[PDB]
Design a protein around this ligand. Structure first.
Ligand SMILES: O=c1ccn([C@@H]2O[C@H](COP(=O)(O)OP(=O)(O)O)[C@@H](O)[C@H]2O)c(=O)[nH]1
Ligand SMILES: *[C@@H]1O[C@H](CO)[C@@H](O)[C@H](O)[C@H]1NC(C)=O
Lengths: 14, 695
């Protein structure tokens, strides 16, 4: 969120 | 010089044969004969980088760029190494120098684009990907990465042709036996066949096998019974998300709810301690907590898992950020299962099971998974909402005039006591209603003035827009709020006299067909708005443009910023109906909206990720909200928005069933999860290979 962080499910690097 | 040329040739030969250490030895021998050998330094650095020796690879990259100042390829690959070492600024310098040395270097522009992408700067990533493709039109990695950028911001220019080209690229790469340029986690968003999606994942699982085969470790000896564990089954949960992340927001209570007489819980953390209460709780309630982030070697970390005697190792990452699937490729445990964190198949032979359910993964689409299906009785999905947000179990409303349940809302642990201090409180049949009086005017005044909080009869009344100023740990879900919170449609600019359809997902889950469906619903329900999030904000102008092309004025769609976790869940009470994304459903997001009591309309597809919402609703007990096709989805949504008595019934049903159904019952979930574990074990202990557990 603006001013903080909202972690989500995201892909790993390749 | 000539001898060093021959030595570098032999090292390249031994490299292709897979003898990496002989290649290293011969690269070093070439450098011994001719020290100022740029190609040898660059070859050796590439080999060291593949082994994971990033610091040592950096040494030889630095030599290569000094000897050959025009060695643009070395700067680019050096930046790749710095990116993996998490030195983003250093990697940007190397990519920038590579493009300065050779402006036609397509790979360097694409690598620079990925830095912008990872940094959040999608318009800059898109610009750099298009430059790469202008320089090299046949460039799968850049084309597929550009496609995902355009997905994130809902840029659907030439969408059908784009989707056709993505399929063609994957078909060619699978045919030519190369690693697909589409990431397995993204494959759910594209109209690939189930076979292609499984094959993409299978190719990634083979990467992990290739990385662990160089360790030349033998197969582990696995326990054959439960004697050495005193009759207890040893379950190891492996996750990079023990901390502030959706994973812990779903399952942080499950380790402490396991039965210690029959289970011994090991939590293997792939990330360092982020200091949050989510990490505190899992560390305190698991029987054992092991920080594998301190053990970078996958061989030594796998030895640790095997030493603990784990019977069932649980993969909670799949192909998501922070994963170390090399641990599972080494097979330290006799049973290894996918659970909760990754909505797709691993495609890998070292994963035995995927924990799902009949609604999410019916036996008919089992060919989509490489694992054997392992059914939970209701849904495999779970959430910690009853523990994290108990203040939303009940609510009260303020009648600012019939009676609305979602215009002005109060929630709080001490709400009942506050209500008991007020006269003329009415109970609607049960929802308490505060009449329009001096108390009610003071609340509205606080909201309009942007005030943080007030006091009424000694009770703390907080503005729901200001939780990070009152208690930041309450705003993130790390603590239960200790004040009474006000949530109102005026806080977000929502109409007081219209139906509010919401969707709080990241915008990447929307596609053209979905927005057209939503536009059809808004046209049929003239007194309604669609409520979406700036997720990211740069997707907002694209959605609005497509909505305007579909015939919807700007005032039919309302955007809100992404909110802290508790405010996100709490403000879902203001909507009438959630319209779920069929391409990839709300997963964590669907649990969030249902905990607020909001009915959710879904159209399940064929992939796991497109069926999670219907499974949640089936467990909740609302079969009437599950659509078989796009027309039924529209019809259901329009009926909820126009049959106001039906809407009240369904909202009452969701409101009650989120408590009385199994959906949010973490104790029941753990016990069913334990029943499924013992089925896996007793099947293995009897000497059988994994088979479907679907009863
Ligand atoms: O305004 C918002 C919208 C969402 N979320 C959270 O952000 C995450 C969304 O991540 P993801 O897209 O991976 O959710 P999922 O696919 O599981 O539905 C979830 O934890 C939500 O609860 C939030 O905190 N504030
Ligand atoms: C996000 O993370 C949660 C919890 O790990 C998971 O259940 C969900 O499927 C993830 N979402 C996506 C789109 O991968």
């Amino acid at each position: 969120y603006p001013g903080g962080s909202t972690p989500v499910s995201s892909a790993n690097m390749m | 010089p000539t001898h060093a040329d021959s030595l570098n040739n032999l090292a390249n030969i031994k490299r292709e044969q897979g003898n990496i250490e002989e290649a290293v030895r011969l690269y070093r021998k070439a450098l011994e004969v001719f020290p100022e050998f740029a190609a040898a330094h660059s070859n050796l650095a590439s080999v060291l980088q593949q082994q994971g020796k990033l610091q040592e690879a950096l040494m030889h990259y630095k030599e290569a760029i000094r000897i050959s100042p025009t060695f643009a390829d070395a700067y680019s690959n050096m930046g790749n190494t710095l990116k993996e070492m998490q030195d983003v600024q250093g990697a940007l310098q190397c990519y920038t120098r590579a493009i300065q040395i050779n402006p036609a270097f397509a790979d360097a522009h694409s690598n620079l684009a990925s830095i912008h992408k990872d940094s959040g700067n999608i318009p800059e990533a898109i610009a750099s990907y298009r430059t790469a493709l202008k320089l090299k039109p046949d460039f799968p990695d850049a084309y597929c990465n550009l496609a995902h950028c355009l997905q994130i911001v809902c840029d659907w220019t030439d969408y059908d042709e784009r989707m056709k080209k993505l399929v063609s690229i994957v078909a060619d790469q699978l045919e030519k036996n190369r690693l697909p340029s589409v990431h397995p986690h993204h494959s759910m968003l594209y109209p690939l066949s189930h076979g292609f999606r499984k094959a993409i994942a299978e190719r990634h699982g083979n990467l992990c096998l290739d990385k662990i085969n160089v360790l030349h470790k033998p197969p582990y000896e696995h326990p054959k019974d439960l004697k050495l564990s005193d009759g207890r089954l040893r379950v190891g949960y492996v996750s990079s998300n023990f901390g502030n992340h959706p994973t812990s927001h779903l399952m942080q209570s499950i380790p402490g709810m396991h039965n210690p007489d029959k289970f011994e819980v090991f939590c293997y953390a792939l990330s360092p301690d982020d200091g949050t209460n989510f990490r505190v709780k899992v560390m305190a309630e698991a029987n054992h907590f092991i920080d594998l982030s301190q053990i970078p070697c996958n061989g030594k970390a796998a030895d640790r898992i095997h030493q603990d005697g784990i019977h069932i190792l649980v993969n909670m990452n799949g192909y998501t950020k922070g994963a170390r699937n090399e641990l599972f490729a080494l097979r330290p445990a006799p049973i290894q299962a996918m659970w909760l964190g990754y909505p797709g198949t691993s495609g890998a032979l070292f994963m035995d099971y995927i924990i799902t359910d009949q609604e999410t993964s019916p036996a008919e689409v089992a060919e989509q998974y490489s694992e054997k299906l392992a059914y939970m009785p209701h849904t495999f999905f779970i959430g910690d909402h009853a523990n994290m947000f108990p203040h939303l179990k009940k609510k009260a409303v303020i009648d600012f005039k019939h009676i609305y349940d979602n215009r002005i809302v109060l929630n709080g642990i001490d709400l009942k006591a506050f209500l008991d201090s007020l006269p003329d409180v009415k109970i609607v049949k049960n929802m308490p209603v505060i009449p329009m009086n001096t108390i009610a005017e003071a609340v509205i005044e606080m909201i309009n003035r942007g005030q943080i909080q007030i006091t009424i009869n000694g009770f703390s009344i907080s503005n729901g827009l200001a939780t990070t100023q009152i208690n930041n740990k309450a705003a993130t879900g790390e603590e239960v709020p200790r004040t009474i919170i006000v949530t109102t449609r005026s806080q977000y600019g929502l109409p007081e006299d219209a139906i509010v359809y919401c969707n709080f997902n990241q915008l990447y889950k929307i596609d053209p067909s979905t927005l057209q469906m939503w536009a059809n619903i808004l046209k049929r329900v003239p007194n309604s708005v669609l409520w979406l999030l700036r997720f990211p904000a740069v997707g907002e102008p694209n959605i609005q443009q497509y909505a305007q092309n579909m015939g919807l004025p700007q005032n039919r769609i309302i955007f809100s910023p992404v909110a802290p976790k508790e405010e996100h869940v709490r403000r879902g009470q203001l909507a009438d109906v959630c319209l779920d994304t069929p391409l990839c459903n709300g997963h964590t997001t669907g649990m969030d909206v249902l905990w607020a009591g909001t009915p959710m309309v879904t159209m399940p597809g064929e992939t796991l990720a497109s069926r999670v919402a219907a499974s949640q609703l089936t467990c909740l007990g609302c079969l009437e909200l599950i659509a078989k096709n796009r027309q039924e989805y529209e019809d259901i949504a329009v009926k909820l928005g126009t049959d106001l008595e039906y809407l009240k019934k369904v909202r009452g049903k969701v409101w009650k069933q989120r408590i009385s159904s199994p959906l949010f019952n973490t104790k029941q979930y753990t016990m069913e999860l334990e029943r499924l574990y013992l089925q896996m074990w007793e099947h293995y202990a009897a000497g059988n290979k994994p088979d479907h557990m679907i009863k």
